[PDB]
Amino acid sequence: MLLHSVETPRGEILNVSEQEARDVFGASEQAIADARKATILQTLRIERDERLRACDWTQVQDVVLTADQKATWAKYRQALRDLPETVTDLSQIVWPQLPV
């Protein structure tokens, strides 16, 4: 996990570790925590969407899988959605790992 954006004293930096941000760019510990909160907040929402759209290869019934397999995968999406879609993602998301 690296901070997708730290607005350091020398300006804005894209895709940077907490180490690199402080070491080279001289980012504040309040600027690290902020960017950490915000990278987490970005990751968890997008990650839920990733689990849906990446596993969409099973959801398209064109694939040659059993109804059981496709149902387990239709449950995979629906279980991620059964978990409340966390607005302002400041809670450790624990969701299903894929069956196959």
Residue 93: HSE in the Cβ half-sphere, 13 Å Cα cutoff:
26
Element of type H or E holding 61: none
Q: Work out the burial of residue 25: count CB atoms within 10 Å of its CB; fewer than 13 is exposed, 13-18 middle, 19 or more buried.
A: middle
Query: What's 13's DSSP letter?
Result: E
Structure tokens belonging to residue 35: 């960017």
Structural domains of the chain in order of their starting residue, each with its CATH number: 1-81 (6.10.140.1310)
Using DSSP, state whether 44 is helix, strand or coil: helix
Beta strands in 17-91 (DSSP E): none
- Using what technique was this structure determined? NMR
Closest-CA residue to 14 (of 25, 27, 3) = 3
How many angstroms separate the CA atoms of 62 and 32, rounded? Answer: 46
Question: Is 88 exposed, middle or buried (CB count within 10 Å of its CB: 0-12, 13-18, 19+)?
Answer: exposed
